[PDB]
Short mmCIF file of N, CA and C in Angstrom, two decimals:
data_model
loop_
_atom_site.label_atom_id
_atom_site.label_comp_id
_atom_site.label_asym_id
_atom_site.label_seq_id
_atom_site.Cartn_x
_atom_site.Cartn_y
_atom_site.Cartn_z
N UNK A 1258 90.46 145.50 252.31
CA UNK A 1258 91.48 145.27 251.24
C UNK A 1258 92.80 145.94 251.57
N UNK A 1259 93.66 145.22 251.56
CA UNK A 1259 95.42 145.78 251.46
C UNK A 1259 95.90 145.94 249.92
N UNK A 1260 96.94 146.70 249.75
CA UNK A 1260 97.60 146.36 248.72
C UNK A 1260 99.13 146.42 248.96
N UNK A 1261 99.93 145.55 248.43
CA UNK A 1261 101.26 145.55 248.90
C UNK A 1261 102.41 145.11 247.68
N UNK A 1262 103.44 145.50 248.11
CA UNK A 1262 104.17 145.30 246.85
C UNK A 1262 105.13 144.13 246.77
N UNK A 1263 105.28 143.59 245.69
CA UNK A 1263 105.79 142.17 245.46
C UNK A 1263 106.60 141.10 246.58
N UNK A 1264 107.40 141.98 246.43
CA UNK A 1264 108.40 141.31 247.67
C UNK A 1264 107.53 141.35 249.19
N UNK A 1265 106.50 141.67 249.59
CA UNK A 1265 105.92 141.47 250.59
C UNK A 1265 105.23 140.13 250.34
N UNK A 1266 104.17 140.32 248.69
CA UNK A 1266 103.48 139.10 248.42
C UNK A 1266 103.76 137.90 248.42
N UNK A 1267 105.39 138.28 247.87
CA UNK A 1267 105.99 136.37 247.55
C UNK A 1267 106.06 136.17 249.47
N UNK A 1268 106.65 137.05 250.06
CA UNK A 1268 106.84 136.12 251.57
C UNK A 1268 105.78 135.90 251.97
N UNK A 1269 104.16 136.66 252.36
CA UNK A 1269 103.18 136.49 252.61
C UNK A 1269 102.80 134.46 251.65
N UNK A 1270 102.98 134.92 250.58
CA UNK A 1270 102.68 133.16 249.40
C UNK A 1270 103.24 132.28 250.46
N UNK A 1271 104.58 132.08 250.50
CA UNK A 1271 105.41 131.37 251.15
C UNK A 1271 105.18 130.87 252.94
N UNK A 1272 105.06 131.63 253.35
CA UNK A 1272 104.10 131.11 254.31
C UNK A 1272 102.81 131.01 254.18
N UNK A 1273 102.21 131.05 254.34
CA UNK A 1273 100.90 130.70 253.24
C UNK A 1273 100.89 129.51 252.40
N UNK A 1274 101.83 128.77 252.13
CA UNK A 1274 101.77 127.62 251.65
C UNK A 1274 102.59 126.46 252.74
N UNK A 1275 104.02 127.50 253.31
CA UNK A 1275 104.80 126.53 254.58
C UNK A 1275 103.50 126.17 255.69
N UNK A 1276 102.45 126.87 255.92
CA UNK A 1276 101.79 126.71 256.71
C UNK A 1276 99.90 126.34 255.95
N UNK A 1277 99.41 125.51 255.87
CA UNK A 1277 98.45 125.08 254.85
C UNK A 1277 97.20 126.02 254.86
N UNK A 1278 97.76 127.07 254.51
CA UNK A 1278 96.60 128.45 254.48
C UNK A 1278 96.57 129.30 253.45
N UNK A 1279 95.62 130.44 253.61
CA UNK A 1279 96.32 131.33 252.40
C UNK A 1279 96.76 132.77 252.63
N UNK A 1280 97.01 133.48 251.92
CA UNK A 1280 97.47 134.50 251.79
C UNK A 1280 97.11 135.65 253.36
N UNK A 1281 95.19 136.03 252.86
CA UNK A 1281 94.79 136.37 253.87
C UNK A 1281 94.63 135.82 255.21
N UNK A 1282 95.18 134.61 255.34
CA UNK A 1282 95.15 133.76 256.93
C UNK A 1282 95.98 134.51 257.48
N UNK A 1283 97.63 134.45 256.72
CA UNK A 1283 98.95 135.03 257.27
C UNK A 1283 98.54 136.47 257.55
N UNK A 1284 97.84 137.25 257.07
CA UNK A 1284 97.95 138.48 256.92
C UNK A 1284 97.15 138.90 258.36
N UNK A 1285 96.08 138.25 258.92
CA UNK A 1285 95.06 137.76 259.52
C UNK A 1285 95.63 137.52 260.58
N UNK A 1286 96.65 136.41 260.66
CA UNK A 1286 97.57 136.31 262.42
C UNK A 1286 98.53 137.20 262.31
N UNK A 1287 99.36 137.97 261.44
CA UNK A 1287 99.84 138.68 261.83
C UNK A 1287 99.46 140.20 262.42
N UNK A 1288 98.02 140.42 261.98
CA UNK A 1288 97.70 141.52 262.32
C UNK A 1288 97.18 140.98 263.77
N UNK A 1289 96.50 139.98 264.55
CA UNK A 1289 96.13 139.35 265.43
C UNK A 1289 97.66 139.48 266.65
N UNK A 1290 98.47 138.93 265.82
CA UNK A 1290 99.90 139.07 266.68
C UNK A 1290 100.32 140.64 267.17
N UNK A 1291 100.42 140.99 266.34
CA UNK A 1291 101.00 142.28 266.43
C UNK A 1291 100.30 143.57 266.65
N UNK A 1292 98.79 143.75 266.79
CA UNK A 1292 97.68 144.26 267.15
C UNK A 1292 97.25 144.22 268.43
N UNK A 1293 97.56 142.68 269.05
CA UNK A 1293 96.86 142.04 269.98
C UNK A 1293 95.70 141.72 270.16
N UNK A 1294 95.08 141.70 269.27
CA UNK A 1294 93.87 141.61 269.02
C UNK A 1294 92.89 139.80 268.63
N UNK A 1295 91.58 140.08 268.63
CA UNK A 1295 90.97 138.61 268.68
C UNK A 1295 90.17 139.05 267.35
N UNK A 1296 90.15 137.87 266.38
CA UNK A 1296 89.26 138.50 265.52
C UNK A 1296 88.71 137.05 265.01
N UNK A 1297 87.32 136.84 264.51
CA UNK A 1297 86.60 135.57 264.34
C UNK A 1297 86.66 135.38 262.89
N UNK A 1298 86.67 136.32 262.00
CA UNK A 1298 87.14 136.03 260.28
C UNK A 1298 87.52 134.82 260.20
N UNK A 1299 87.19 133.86 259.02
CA UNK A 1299 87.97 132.72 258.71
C UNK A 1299 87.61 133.01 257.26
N UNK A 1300 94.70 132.53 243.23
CA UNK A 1300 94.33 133.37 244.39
C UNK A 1300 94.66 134.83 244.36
N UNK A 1301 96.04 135.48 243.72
CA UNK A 1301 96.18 137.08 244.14
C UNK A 1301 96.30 137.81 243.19
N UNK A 1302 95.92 138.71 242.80
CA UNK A 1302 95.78 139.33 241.59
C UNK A 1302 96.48 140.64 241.81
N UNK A 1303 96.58 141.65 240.84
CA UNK A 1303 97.44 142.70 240.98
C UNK A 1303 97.50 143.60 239.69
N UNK A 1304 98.21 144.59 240.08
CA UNK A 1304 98.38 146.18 239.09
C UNK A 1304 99.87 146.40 238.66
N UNK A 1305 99.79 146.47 237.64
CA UNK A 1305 100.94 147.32 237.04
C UNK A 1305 101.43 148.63 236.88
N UNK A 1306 102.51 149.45 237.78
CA UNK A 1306 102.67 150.52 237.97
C UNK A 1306 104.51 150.75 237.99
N UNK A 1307 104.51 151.43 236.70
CA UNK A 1307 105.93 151.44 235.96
C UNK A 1307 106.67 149.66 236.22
N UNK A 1308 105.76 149.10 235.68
CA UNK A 1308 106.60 147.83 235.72
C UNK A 1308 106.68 147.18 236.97
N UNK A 1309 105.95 147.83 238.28
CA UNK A 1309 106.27 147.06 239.15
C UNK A 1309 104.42 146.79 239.42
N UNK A 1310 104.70 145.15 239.96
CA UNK A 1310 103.53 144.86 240.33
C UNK A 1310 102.81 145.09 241.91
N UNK A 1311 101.94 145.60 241.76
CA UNK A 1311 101.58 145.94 243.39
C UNK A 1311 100.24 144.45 243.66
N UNK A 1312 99.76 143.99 244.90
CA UNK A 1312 98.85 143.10 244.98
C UNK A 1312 98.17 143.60 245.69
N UNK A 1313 96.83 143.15 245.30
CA UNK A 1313 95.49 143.67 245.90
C UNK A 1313 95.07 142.63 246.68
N UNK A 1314 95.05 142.31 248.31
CA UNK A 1314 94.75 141.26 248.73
C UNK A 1314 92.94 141.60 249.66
N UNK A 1315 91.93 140.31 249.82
CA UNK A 1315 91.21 140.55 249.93
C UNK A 1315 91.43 140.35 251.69
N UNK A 1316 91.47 141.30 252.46
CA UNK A 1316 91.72 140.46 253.88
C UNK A 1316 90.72 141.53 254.48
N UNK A 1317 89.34 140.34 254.70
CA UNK A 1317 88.71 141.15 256.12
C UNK A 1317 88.69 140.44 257.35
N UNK A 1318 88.55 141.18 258.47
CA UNK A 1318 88.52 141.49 259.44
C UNK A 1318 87.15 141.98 259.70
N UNK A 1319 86.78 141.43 261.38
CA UNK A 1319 85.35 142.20 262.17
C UNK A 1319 85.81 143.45 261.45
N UNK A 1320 84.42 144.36 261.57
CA UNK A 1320 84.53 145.71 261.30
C UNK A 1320 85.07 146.69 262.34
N UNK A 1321 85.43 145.92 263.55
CA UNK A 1321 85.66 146.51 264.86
C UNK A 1321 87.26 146.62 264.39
N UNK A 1322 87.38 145.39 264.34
CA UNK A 1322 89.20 145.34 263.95
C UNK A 1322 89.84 145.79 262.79
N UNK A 1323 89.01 146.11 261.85
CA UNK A 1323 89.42 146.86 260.84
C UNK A 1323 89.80 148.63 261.48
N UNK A 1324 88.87 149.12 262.08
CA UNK A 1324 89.00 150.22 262.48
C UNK A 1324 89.92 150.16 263.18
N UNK A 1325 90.77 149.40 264.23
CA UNK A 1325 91.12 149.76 265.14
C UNK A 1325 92.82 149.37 264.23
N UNK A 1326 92.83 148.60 263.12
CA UNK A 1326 93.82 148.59 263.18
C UNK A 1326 94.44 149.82 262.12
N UNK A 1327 93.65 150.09 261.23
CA UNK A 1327 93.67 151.80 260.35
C UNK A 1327 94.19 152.56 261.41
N UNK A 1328 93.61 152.54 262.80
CA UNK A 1328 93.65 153.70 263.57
C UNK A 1328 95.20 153.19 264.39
N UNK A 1329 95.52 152.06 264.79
CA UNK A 1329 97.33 152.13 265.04
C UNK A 1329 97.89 152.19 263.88
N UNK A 1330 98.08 151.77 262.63
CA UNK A 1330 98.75 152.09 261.84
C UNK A 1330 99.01 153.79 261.55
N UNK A 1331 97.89 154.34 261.45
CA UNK A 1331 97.97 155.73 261.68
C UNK A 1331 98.77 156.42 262.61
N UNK A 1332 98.23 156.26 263.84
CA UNK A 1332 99.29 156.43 265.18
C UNK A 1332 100.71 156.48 264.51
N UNK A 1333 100.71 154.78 264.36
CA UNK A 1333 102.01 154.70 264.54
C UNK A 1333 102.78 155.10 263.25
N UNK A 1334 101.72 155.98 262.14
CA UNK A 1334 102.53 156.29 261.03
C UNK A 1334 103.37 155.52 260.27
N UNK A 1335 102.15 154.63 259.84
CA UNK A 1335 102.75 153.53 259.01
C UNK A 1335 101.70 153.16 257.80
N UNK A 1336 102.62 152.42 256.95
CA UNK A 1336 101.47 152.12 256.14
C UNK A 1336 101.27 150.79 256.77
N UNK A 1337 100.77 149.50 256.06
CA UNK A 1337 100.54 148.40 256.32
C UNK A 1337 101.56 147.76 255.94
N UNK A 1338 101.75 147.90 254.28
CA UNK A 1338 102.74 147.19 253.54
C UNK A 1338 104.26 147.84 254.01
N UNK A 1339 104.23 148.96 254.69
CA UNK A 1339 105.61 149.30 254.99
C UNK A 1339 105.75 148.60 256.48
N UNK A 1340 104.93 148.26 257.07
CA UNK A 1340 105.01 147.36 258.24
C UNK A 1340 105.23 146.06 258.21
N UNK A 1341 104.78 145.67 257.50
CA UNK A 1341 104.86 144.43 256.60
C UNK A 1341 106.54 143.95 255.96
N UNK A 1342 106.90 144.87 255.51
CA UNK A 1342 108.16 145.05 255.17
C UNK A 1342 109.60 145.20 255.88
N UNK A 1343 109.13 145.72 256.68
CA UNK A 1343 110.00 146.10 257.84
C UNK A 1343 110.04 144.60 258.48
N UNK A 1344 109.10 144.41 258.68
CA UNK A 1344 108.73 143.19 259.52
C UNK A 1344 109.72 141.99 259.02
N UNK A 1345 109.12 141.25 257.47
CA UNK A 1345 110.39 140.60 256.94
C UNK A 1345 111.68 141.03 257.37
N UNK A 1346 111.84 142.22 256.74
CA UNK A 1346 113.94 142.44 257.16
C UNK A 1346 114.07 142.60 258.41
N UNK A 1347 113.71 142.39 259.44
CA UNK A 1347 114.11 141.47 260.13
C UNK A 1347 113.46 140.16 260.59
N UNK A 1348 114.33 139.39 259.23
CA UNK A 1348 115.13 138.34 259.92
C UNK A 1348 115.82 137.67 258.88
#
């Protein structure tokens, strides 16, 4: 499970619909892309926190690739959703 905050969700939706998939697909090649990684895995609900909505997305991954990607995000001292974010602005 991820959780991420709005403005990540609507772009995650948006492709996710430009491309005939869902939410967790996008979330799924991008961690594949940017991981480098192979993974065989093959709608959003959310929390209210001072008014802002955060989303709880269901995205698994082998259990191999789950670990490994906790463990670069860590490294690289990041969250997910702040990677995620970054990622959008640019472009």
């Amino acid at each position: 499970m991820v959780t991420v905050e709005e403005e990540v969700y609507e772009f995650l939706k948006k492709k996710a619909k430009e491309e005939g998939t869902s939410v967790p697909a996008v979330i799924r090649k991008i961690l594949k892309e940017y991981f480098g990684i192979e993974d065989r895995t093959r709608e959003g609900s959310y929390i209210i926190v001072n008014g802002k909505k955060y989303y709880r997305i269901n995205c698994k991954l082998e259990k191999r690739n789950e670990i490994l990607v906790k463990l670069e995000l860590k490294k690289r001292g990041t969250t997910l959703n702040r990677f995620l974010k970054e990622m959008i602005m640019i472009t």
